């Protein structure tokens, strides 16, 4: 497989999960200044800038990498808020929402 056709699908395939959020609430790392316990349990903070980071520096280089760490957005914010709050059932939207994005794509590469 070629590495140029595989990351031009992870950087469509990121586009396409951060279309999912709405609300840009995973765009950027969680403030620590409004949050200051959050790193307390969190022990690997993850948002979609620092996977684009990851992305670029040649960090994924298999769906898996790639997928992990999105899966990371979604299961630090399920673990830090209660669940009757907006961010907990947006991590539940992004993982439904998400979850047939990251399908689609791994068909793809699988192609590849
Ligand atoms: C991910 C999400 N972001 C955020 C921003 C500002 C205050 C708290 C939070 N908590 C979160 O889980």
């Given at each position: 497989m070629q590495l140029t056709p595989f990351l031009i699908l992870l950087r469509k395939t990121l586009e396409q999960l951060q279309e999912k959020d709405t609300g840009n609430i995973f765009s950027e790392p969680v403030p620590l200044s409004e949050v200051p316990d959050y790193l307390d349990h969190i022990k690997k903070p993850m948002d979609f800038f620092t996977m684009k980071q990851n992305l670029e520096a040649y960090r994924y280089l298999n769906f898996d990498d790639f997928e992990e760490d999105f899966n990371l957005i979604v299961s630090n914010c399920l673990k830090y808020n209660?669940?009757?709050?907006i961010f907990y059932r947006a991590a539940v939207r992004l993982r439904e929402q998400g979850g047939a994005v990251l399908r689609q794509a791994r068909r793809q590469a699988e192609k590849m």
């Open positions: 209660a669940k009757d709050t």
